[PDB]
Design a protein around this ligand. Structure first.
Ligand SMILES: CC(C)(COP(=O)(O)OP(=O)(O)OC[C@H]1O[C@@H](n2cnc3c(N)ncnc32)[C@H](O)[C@@H]1OP(=O)(O)O)[C@@H](O)C(=O)NCCC(=O)NCCS
Ligand SMILES: CC(C)(COP(=O)(O)OP(=O)(O)OC[C@H]1O[C@@H](n2cnc3c(N)ncnc32)[C@H](O)[C@@H]1OP(=O)(O)O)[C@@H](O)C(=O)NCCC(=O)NCCS
Ligand SMILES: CC(C)(COP(=O)(O)OP(=O)(O)OC[C@H]1O[C@@H](n2cnc3c(N)ncnc32)[C@H](O)[C@@H]1OP(=O)(O)O)[C@@H](O)C(=O)NCCC(=O)NCCS
Ligand SMILES: CC(C)(COP(=O)(O)OP(=O)(O)OC[C@H]1O[C@@H](n2cnc3c(N)ncnc32)[C@H](O)[C@@H]1OP(=O)(O)O)[C@@H](O)C(=O)NCCC(=O)NCCS
Ligand SMILES: [N+]
Ligand SMILES: [N+]
Ligand SMILES: [N+]
Ligand SMILES: [N+]
Lengths: 390, 390, 390, 390
């Protein structure tokens, strides 16, 4: 009934059509699965199941989570499956993997997320036939990942709904984004991402490429050039490409086992999963998802907001990230101390486990005792998890 | 914790490009979600989470499970997500929903599966651009649903591997299929599918159509006409369209709650989830998946194979379905007493909950005490669950 | 400088996605080329060049006119090419083939048109790549065939412009269309199309099918049933599917040689090409094209409007066909005596030679001496040709 | 009776996906039509018809020749149409325009060719529907332009057939290409292409670009670097990208009128069309097309091979260009004195008029009296034209 995170790892977050432009998601997930096994001293033959969140798997083949486990050396006797709760998929898979051990149905779980938004294809239903007229080739990334299915507009429009409702101006969102760019750039140059990042070998034509640094992180971001950017969703809006997360590729996961299992193996876990929660909200303001999700998770853990030593709140948009900080009222100096998704990137299926990796390694590095990770979810949902160090 | 299935429902299984040719999967799932709520006397405002297995969601929009819950009246405060374990997705979602209640994280769960193989689009990655030459538009149904990602051939080829290793001839597979067609046709004419089936209204322009009968069920199947069919995968093989499951659309789900919760509401549950299991096998012979999965489920329940009163083993192929019966050795007269997927249909993401519906309502109809449902999974996996009546 | 039409033939006009749904245009053209050779007693080795009008050749391969000639038995030493003047392509190709003999550059020409609107594919420029967002698969039939490239609307909208300028009401267009349906229906049942139609054998997998009757001809068109039809282009317009031409497939051609050549071979020509003309008009009212084209053709032939015994004016739309009849003032009883494109069909690339075939054989049956064929052309053009019997 | 070329012009030949990557073909043709009118002092209202050869018009709209004329200022009263004889379309259109004046049906004709191989889309017939399985998106450039419709292989394979029958080694083909690169590079540096080239303004968003130089011209071509090139068609073949023409965009045309018309307007014509011819050959060796076509043109002109002062023979492939020169036996020093299609480029629909422009202006530059232009045509055809200076 006590589940710990024995190890964690993530690939570098690649830009849209960048280093991982032609790399399938399971190839990134396989590297992460092998990394959490080596870092914990656990062999692949000991894994019972691999649970990987993924939002855009179209065209990758039968169950990409199974392909990642098999390629990482996990034997055929184990099982693997994918799940989709949009942006919270990477974190919910960890909660799902924790429940497999809590119910006594599994002993060792590799849980996380993987996403290749670059490899997302364009699709169209053509079985009935198009007898006459033009038809649209639909971008699966925009349709199945970034567009609300109830109102039809982009997730950035939901951020404009939060910005108008919370009275967050353009200058306040740009200032929040600049702070995120500077924190991520300082953390990258100081090597605070080296422990969590496992290098990925991009096997391509004309030679292999080793990717071990987040390429989407901007250097020397300026407030004046960001004020010149046009709004990306509403012509009279405030959300721009500068104060919003990007389109990215990456993978992240963690190795799960019971606290007694880790103690017999001599493993010092990165943290203990104290509680988790998922709550729904109005799809028009889905960015407010972390507000009830974090409160329920802290309530289940018996913690107060002031008890938290470190917080990782995903920065899908500067508008929604400002609202979550104002509502919950926690000290912003402990939230995303090494930057957020505005600078690091936002691979939907993997962002949930990505910020968990950043949370775990920063908690151990500075000796934080209580931490929380949370994300907003499209369609009006949120997920959160409380972590305690051992 | 003791979790029971308070109610269950399913749509009729439609043929490929048939009654549900232009109906999205979440529309079928929404009808099933509302049905299990009315059948149990539980309102939509009481559901904590909806968990729906789905293999082919490309082009349907952000998280079709969330769309099904919202369309069925489930409030925005609740959560919803999809999961993919291929053919066992519909059944695993019930086991996953059971774990949400076992860990005290939820109270009432709608769990099941939905699949629209007809609405599966053709896709192609076109972000890098096609400078010269032809490129392939990939059928997501074949690629992401029916083709093994490790060996490259169809799931029907894996049935040929099972037929060769178990020495199951063409006449033995056709005889098994004829038995499935006759059992399903007799069950349909006797109305044994009426209780589990909830009608679906296909809203069109030239009038609405009510679908309340499985259209893929064949009437008067003859052994001689099936012996004339050419093999559909191997030119010198034995698996044909007659002795194999079809491509179908449909949805199925169940309402989950604790046994004490069901007693507080005066609900007579359809059954109690005693145990469940999922095991992996060699992808070349994925049809053997139910063999170790069923024994592991019976082992966790403390049951012997002889203790089972009824069995629902998915008939993905006659070759794999014969092998599972020969290895486990249970009485074939209690396995798929109302027919199987060869005659009823095989909507991959929903078949797990489809055979669970047939299992639950047949146990209640004839007073069976111990039941088991199991399916084979592509990529070399299997899933099983044991059900006991109250 | 006197070129006669030694023989002529055409396939039956098939409906959109009908009998010729999967038949390429050059296969239909090859049958017409072989027919006019046998009907005139000329061997394939004697043809110098084949000129076939075609508007929609995308996806059919290198020069479909060359494919039709080679398949029809025309030797490799001869030449072949296609031309595109939209709806007047079938007639202009005959005039172009006549000029080959008039300038002494050729002796025997097979000229006509072929069109397979059913086989017209959907296209999209994808060399630059689609990094993000949806893109349109463009119907080549609508884009390159039925949409004005200067104003962007359908040819039916240009018909509404002619109806508005000429004050042609809905009842006047429907009454004009009914006359065409009744004339075509009576002509088909009386066998008046048998001489001009050469049967085509549609080779399929489940048996060959011989198509020798115009499939688009409807039986018993009623003024009341057409008055209930909704307008097909303008919501407050008058052009409907009943009073407008359809989308059809077919091929037609004629064998051209000098009058001395026909006399040396003992060939009785169907008629002598007296004159031809092509004039442009405003693209907004392209249906008025036949008005100056016919007057310029009659001027070059030295004929008066009253001298014509029979007229074949293409019925692309009832609105444009009424305007040309009122302006030119010829007796409507001699115009389209066997029906027009509203009832028979409108294969764009072949319609020019289609109405020429009907003109030649109708002139021969009733002994008409002077005839004229004309069509309207998209983009604001018209073509006409005068024929005199031998 | 005697038709002269009053003026001629052409755009620069752009590389594949280069300066004209997003420029439609009719935009290039419109500039050429306006150029030949201004250079001759003839207003747009005096042209009777515009004839433009084009092989790949899919997706450009209704009759791109009509779009080019209207955009160039040609009034709506005139007519326009396109024609397709593959690689000989640009030259055949000039012969066709000459026949319009010879038969007294027109007085002033703008004839030439235009081609945008970069804007060629990918297509697929989808009206019947794809019920199951993958399907191919067909590149219209390769299928309708570069692939033989009778044998299924590329035009480069037909060049391998000519090389095999004529025993043309790899070094012999490479030496011919090197000579073409050096002659074309020297002609560009000396400004010998400035008179025939009319600048084209590429209007874009981030600024306009003026294209007035042939971009496909290679600088400092080395014989050894072409020997290192891999064969592009046959793994054991000899035709490579160095000794074969490229994929290019461009447009070219000429102003046609009678000799008396040019004298009445005070125009100094570029030359007189003495004769023309088109002959077919074996499709396997389509590169031999120019051999019988040139002989028939010289026969009609009453000229011997020794009477020719300058020759422009299209260099579709080094294998076919060597064979036609060796068979006809004309002095290689007078053929393609300014380079050929290997270095200049090969826009299929415009190459016929492209080499005519180079022929006309080079004859005037060095005072050549008798010239001939010829091209090979896919599918087994050839075209030729004899020009004499006034
Ligand atoms: C906002 C969005 C539409 C932008 O698309 P994009 O391709 O990522 O925008 P880009 O990364 O190409 O950057 C666009 C341009 O802005 C500039 N720019 C971006 N950020 C900048 C910054 N912080 N400072 C200065 N310039 C910046 C870049 O230079 C870039 O090139 P350009 O100026 O020459 O055009 C897209 O990133 C997006 O939708 N993000 C949200 C993702 C999402 O919703 N996830 C789900 C959350 S629930
Ligand atoms: C077999 C398969 C490849 C194609 O069959 P299909 O696409 O459904 O096409 P059909 O069902 O219409 O069968 C086609 C023909 O067989 C005939 N047929 C099918 N079953 C028959 C039977 N039991 N008796 C007689 N004839 C039969 C049909 O009538 C039809 O005849 P026709 O061609 O003259 O119209 C497809 O059904 C399939 O992939 N099945 C496996 C699904 C799967 O792998 N699921 C996952 C397992 S883990
Ligand atoms: C007019 C047009 C939009 C209609 O396309 P369409 O819908 O496929 O025409 P259809 O006849 O196949 O369908 C029309 C409907 O009205 C009915 N209908 C059509 N003509 C009818 C008539 N004369 N009387 C009664 N009913 C009629 C048809 O039965 C059908 O209804 P249904 O299919 O449910 O039974 C299309 O044919 C068109 O664009 N034509 C013009 C083509 C063109 O521009 N050519 C070049 C001119 S220069
Ligand atoms: C032969 C063909 C397939 C190659 O086209 P292509 O390869 O795209 O032309 P490219 O310039 O892109 O060649 C690309 C490569 O060849 C190299 N190359 C091309 N020509 C070269 C030369 N003369 N010397 C040295 N290198 C050369 C390029 O530098 C480039 O190097 P890379 O391998 O590192 O990419 C194509 O040009 C073709 O089909 N030509 C025939 C066209 C035709 O048939 N027209 C109709 C007449 S019948
Ligand atoms: N960003
Ligand atoms: N079946
Ligand atoms: N019609
Ligand atoms: N080249």
């Amino acid at each position: 009934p006590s589940i710990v995170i024995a190890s964690a790892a993530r690939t570098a977050v690649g830009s849209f059509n960048g280093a991982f432009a032609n790399t399938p998601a399971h190839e990134l997930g396989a590297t992460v699965i092998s990394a959490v096994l080596e870092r914990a001293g656990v062999a692949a033959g000991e894994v019972n199941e691999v649970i990987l969140g993924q939002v855009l798997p179209a065209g990758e083949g039968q169950n990409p989570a199974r392909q990642a486990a098999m390629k990482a050396g996990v034997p055929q006797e184990a099982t693997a499956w994918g799940m989709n709760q949009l942006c919270g998929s990477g974190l919910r898979a960890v909660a799902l993997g924790m429940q497999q051990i809590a119910t006594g149905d599994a002993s060792i779980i590799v849980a996380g997320g993987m996403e290749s938004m670059s490899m997302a294809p364009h699709c169209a239903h053509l079985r009935g036939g198009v007898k006459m007229g033009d038809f649209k080739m639909i971008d699966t990334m925009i349709k199945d990942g970034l567009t609300d299915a109830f109102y039809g507009y982009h997730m950035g429009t939901t951020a404009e709904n939060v910005a108008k409702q919370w009275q967050l101006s353009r200058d306040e969102q740009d200032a929040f984004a600049v702070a995120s760019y500077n924190k991520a750039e300082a953390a990258q140059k100081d090597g605070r991402f080296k422990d969590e990042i496992v290098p990925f070998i991009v096997k391509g034509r004309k030679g292999d490429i080793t990717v071990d640094a987040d390429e989407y992180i901007r250097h020397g971001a300026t407030l004046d050039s960001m004020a010149k950017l046009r709004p990306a969703f509403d012509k009279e809006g405030t959300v721009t490409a500068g104060n919003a997360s990007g389109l990215n590729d990456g993978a992240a996961a963690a190795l799960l086992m019971s606290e007694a299992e880790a103690s017999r193996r001599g493993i010092q876990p990165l943290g203990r999963i104290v509680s988790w929660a998922t709550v729904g909200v109005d799809p028009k303001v889905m960015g407010t998802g972390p507000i009830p999700a974090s409160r329920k998770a802290l309530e289940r853990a018996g913690w107060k907001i002031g008890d938290l030593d470190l917080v990782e709140a995903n920065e899908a948009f500067a508008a929604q990230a400002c609202a979550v900080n104002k509502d919950l009222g926690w000290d912003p100096s402990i939230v995303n101390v090494n930057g957020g998704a505005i600078a690091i990137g936002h691979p939907i299926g993997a962002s949930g486990a990505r910020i968990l990796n950043t949370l775990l390694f920063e908690m151990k590095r500075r000796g934080a005792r209580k931490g929380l990770a949370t994300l907003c979810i499209g369609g009006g949902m949120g997920v959160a998890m409380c972590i305690e160090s051992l």
